[PDB]
């Protein structure tokens, strides 16, 4: 149900409070709810549009000279002056010659020339730049209990097709068969937008900082200059070659492109042709359950005599997939599915897919379950035809609270205070972590931003000796909150 | 020129991964490194020199790798 | 109950100056620019106009900024156009246009609304 | 340096159509100012919409507008008869100055 | 949470917009405009304060 296979899976479940719960989700994270009743949803954001940008600042790349000339002048009699210094098109540049009687001047000394070309262009880039309205978030709610090929696929419609604006409601998803899906999306906190410009090169595009955008040495020219000839930081892509004191000229610098795609170590990638289109960024939402049906009650139990046709798959981290396939009549019908140990004593392990029915008994359903650590005993059907299949999920213990616990830091990693949603308000503790996690990420940020992959290790290590040795009980204050966790956030970045 | 300030500390990552990442991660310190071994007589110097000033013995290792580092 | 009518010339060979004139009534005069714009029979409306106040300043049209020239009376209450070397082409109806300044006097940005009042339309022709 | 609206439109009476007119950011692509006007032919021209969606006293709410960043709009929501007169649309540049449209003559049969 | 400025906005003939001001605080705070159906809830997100 386009979640299974998708390595970031993030399950969430509680409905606790009212009817609501906090999720947030990502483009390359699929999230699936789980309740006690409210039927199992698979949240995937599959594109950002950002609608109608407006350019900036266009930078050149590649540029030409035509039109060199140079004039000079005899010595202490003043500069020279050149007839096409005039236009801001050609590029000046004074300096001093040696001159005599071999040159025809006199007084032999340093005289003045100066060097014009014209500057042209031949390869630009455009900043685009949008503002946090008019701009359209796509994601797709698809719900659970399986028709036949319909997994993990993103071919085809199975989901509902919901955009999401600033503008926009509660934004009602109407799932034919299961209730109604309303979502409180917040888009305008999501991304920071105004402080991000859409840069777009030839045929490609990125998503860089404003200020890192501005702060660029190449020749620009502002965005709403129609007829752009008046580059104007032009002596970053020229040069003035005055080896001896002599004849100077002028080369131009050639093109900055590969020097360009160097400079964009950090950019993630975006597509900028037909569409602004982004794949990056999230953004997090409030999602209300308070009209959802299961759809299966009204069905009698099933007669038995299943029939599997895909196996039992562990499709990562113990959550495994079944596609019976039915055989009998009585066609609308609830399926018999439950997860026993050796003998058929005591449930182990939930049900995923809760309550999966039969329709159109040629037809196979797909069913997600997941079973407990050890020996469990997969069961589809009743006594005359029954399936007692045997699955032994490999058998951690709290390694999964530990690996629960290095996603949960990871997730705090990419996600600096929006981490602390996938929890439906616990109040005293959920919004104080929040909130001094907001107090403490502004001090780790605009105060260590700037530096790399290698420097936050450097610098983690300095303050790790420097705590390690101090006194007044200051060794835990300088080792657990900003040694070990500028260690950490210097190998979890550059993703 | 513009393949330096590469847009590194900026903030802005998200999961997806960013243009050259697993290519520009590890490229600073082959760089030096190869300029070490191409260049080692300023490290002996940067050995010396850090030796000499930064009396305690955190301060030495501390000069020493931020001498051989600035000089690229 | 605002009202601005105007004059009409009959025929102006090609070479000799011609002038209109609107007479804006209804409002406070010294309070509000004037603007001229031109429709040829069956073609568009271009912007001939400036930007008149209390002060009496102008702004002119890119396309013929060596031609036309200005002359005002807050007396009479009326604002002149004065077409010189008029041309062949040059058979258009001239219409009247109104906006209002700022309440500092000057005219830099105009008001949300151009042109909520008119004029009725001076035709010229060529011989 | 004119706006671009076409040359003329057709419409059935109780239809809702839209006329367009497209611009450069000067025009249109920056600034809320884009104004339409009718001209019926025996008749100085009346102002239909305002800044970009606003309206005058008189004028039915028959009338609306949007923009699209270079593109301006104007959608009349059931057509009557008395609707035959061409629509000049209007902008204000950064420069400082005024342009118009072609003009979009629309017939109601 | 939030102050209106223009005070007890009203609508007079209907066919004519109404412009609204008020100040949202430091966070994020909602707008909320009709009643039962379609009660035009926005968002709105402000920086520091
Ligand atoms: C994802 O869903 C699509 C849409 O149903 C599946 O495509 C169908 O494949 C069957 C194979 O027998 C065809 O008969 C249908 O005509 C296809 N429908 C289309 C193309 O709309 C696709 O197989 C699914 N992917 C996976 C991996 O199960």
């Known amino acids: 149900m386009r979640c299974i296979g998708i390595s970031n899976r993030d399950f969430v479940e509680g409905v606790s409070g009212g009817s609501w719960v906090d999720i947030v989700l990502e483009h390359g994270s699929c999230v699936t709810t789980m309740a006690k009743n409210k039927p199992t949803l698979d949240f995937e954001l599959i594109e950002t549009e950002a609608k109608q940008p407006a350019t900036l600042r266009k930078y050149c790349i590649e540029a030409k000279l035509t039109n060199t000339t140079t004039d000079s002048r005899c010595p202490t009699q003043g500069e020279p002056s050149l007839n096409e210094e005039q236009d801001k098109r050609f590029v000046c540049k004074h300096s001093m010659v040696d001159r005599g009687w071999g040159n025809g001047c006199g007084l032999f000394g340093k005289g003045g020339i100066v060097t014009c070309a014209m500057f042209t262009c031949k390869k630009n880039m455009k900043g685009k730049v949008v503002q946090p309205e008019n701009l359209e978030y796509t994601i797709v709610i698809t719900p659970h209990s399986g028709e036949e090929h319909a997994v993990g696929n993103d071919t085809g419609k199975h989901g509902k097709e919901i955009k999401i604006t600033p503008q926009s409601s509660i934004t009602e998803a109407e799932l034919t068969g299961y209730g109604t899906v309303t979502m409180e999306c917040s888009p305008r906190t999501g991304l920071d937008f105004n402080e991000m410009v859409l840069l777009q090169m030839e045929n490609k595009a990125w998503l860089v900082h404003r200020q890192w955008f501005l702060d660029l040495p190449l020749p620009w020219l502002p965005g709403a200059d129609t007829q752009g000839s008046n580059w104007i930081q032009k002596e970053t892509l020229v040069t003035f070659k005055n080896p001896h004191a002599k004849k100077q000229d002028v080369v131009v610098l050639g093109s900055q492109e590969g020097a360009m795609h160097t400079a964009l170590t950090g950019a993630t990638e975006i597509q900028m042709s037909s569409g602004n289109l982004l794949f990056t960024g999230h953004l997090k939402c409030r999602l209300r359950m308070d009209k959802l049906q299961l759809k299966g009650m009204s069905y009698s139990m099933c007669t038995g005599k299943f029939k599997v046709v895909k196996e039992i798959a562990e499709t990562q981290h113990g959550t495994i997939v079944i596609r019976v396939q039915y055989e009998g009549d009585g066609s609308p019908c609830k399926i018999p599915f439950e997860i026993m140990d050796l003998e058929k004593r005591h449930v182990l392990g939930r049900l995923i897919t809760v309550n999966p029915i039969v329709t159109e008994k040629d037809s196979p359903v797909n069913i997600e379950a997941e079973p407990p650590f050890g020996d469990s005993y997969i069961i589809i059907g009743v006594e005359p035809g029954q399936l007692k299949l045997n699955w032994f999920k490999k058998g951690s213990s709290i390694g999964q609270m530990i690996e629960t616990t290095m996603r949960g830091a990871k997730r705090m990693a990419i996600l600096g205070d929006t981490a602390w949603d996938f929890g439906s308000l616990g109040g005293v503790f959920t919004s104080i972590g929040k909130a001094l996690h907001q107090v403490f990420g502004a001090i780790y940020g605009a105060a260590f931003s700037g530096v790399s992959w290698i420097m936050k290790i450097l610098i983690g290590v300095i303050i790790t000796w420097i705590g390690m040795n101090s006194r007044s009980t200051s060794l835990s204050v300088s080792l657990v909150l900003v040694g070990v966790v500028t260690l950490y956030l210097g190998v979890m970045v550059q993703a | 020129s513009v393949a330096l300030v590469p847009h590194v500390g900026m903030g802005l990552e998200t999961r997806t991964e960013t243009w050259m990442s697993s290519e520009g991660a590890w490229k600073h310190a082959q760089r030096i490194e190869t300029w070490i071994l191409r260049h080692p007589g300023f490290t002996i110097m940067a050995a010396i020199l850090a030796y000499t000033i930064g009396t305690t013995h955190f301060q030495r290792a501390l000069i020493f790798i931020l001498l051989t580092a600035v000089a690229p | 109950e605002v009202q601005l009518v105007e004059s009409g010339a009959e025929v102006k060979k090609p070479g000799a100056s011609v002038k209109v004139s609107c007479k804006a009534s209804?409002?406070?005069?010294?309070?509000?620019?004037m603007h001229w714009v031109r429709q040829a029979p069956g073609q568009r409306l271009e912007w001939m106009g400036w930007?008149?106040?209390?002060?009496?300043?102008?702004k002119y049209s890119q396309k013929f900024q060596d031609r036309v020239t200005i002359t005002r009376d807050t007396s009479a209450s009326t604002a002149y156009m004065e077409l010189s070397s008029l041309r062949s082409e040059d058979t258009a109806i001239y219409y009247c246009?109104?906006?209002?300044?700022?309440?500092?006097?000057?005219?830099?940005?105009?008001?949300?609304?151009?042109?909520?009042?008119w004029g009725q339309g001076t035709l010229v022709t060529v011989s | 340096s004119a706006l671009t609206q076409p040359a003329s439109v057709s419409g059935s009476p109780g239809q809702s159509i839209t006329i367009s007119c497209t611009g450069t950011?000067?025009?249109?692509?920056?600034?809320?100012?884009v104004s339409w006007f009718q001209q019926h032919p025996g008749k100085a021209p009346k102002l239909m919409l305002y800044?970009?969606?606003s309206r005058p006293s008189g004028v039915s709410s028959r009338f609306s507008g949007s923009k699209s960043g270079n593109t301006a709009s104007l959608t009349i929501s059931g057509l009557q008869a008395e609707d035959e007169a061409d629509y000049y649309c209007?902008?204000?540049?950064?420069?400082?100055?005024?342009?118009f449209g072609g003009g979009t003559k629309l017939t109601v049969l | 949470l939030g102050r209106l400025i223009t005070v007890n906005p009203i609508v007079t003939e209907k066919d004519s917009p109404v412009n609204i001001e008020a100040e949202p605080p430091f966070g994020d705070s909602y707008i909320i405009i009709g009643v039962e159906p379609g009660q035009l809830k926005l968002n709105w997100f402000k920086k520091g304060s």
């Open positions: 209007s902008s204000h540049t950064s420069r400082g100055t005024w342009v």
């Open positions: 950011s000067s025009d249109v692509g920056g600034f809320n100012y």
């Open positions: 209804g409002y406070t005069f010294t309070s509000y620019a």
């Open positions: 800044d970009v969606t």
């Open positions: 930007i008149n106040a209390g002060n009496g300043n102008t």
């Open positions: 246009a109104r906006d209002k300044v700022d309440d500092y006097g000057d005219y830099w940005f105009p008001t949300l609304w151009y042109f909520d009042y």
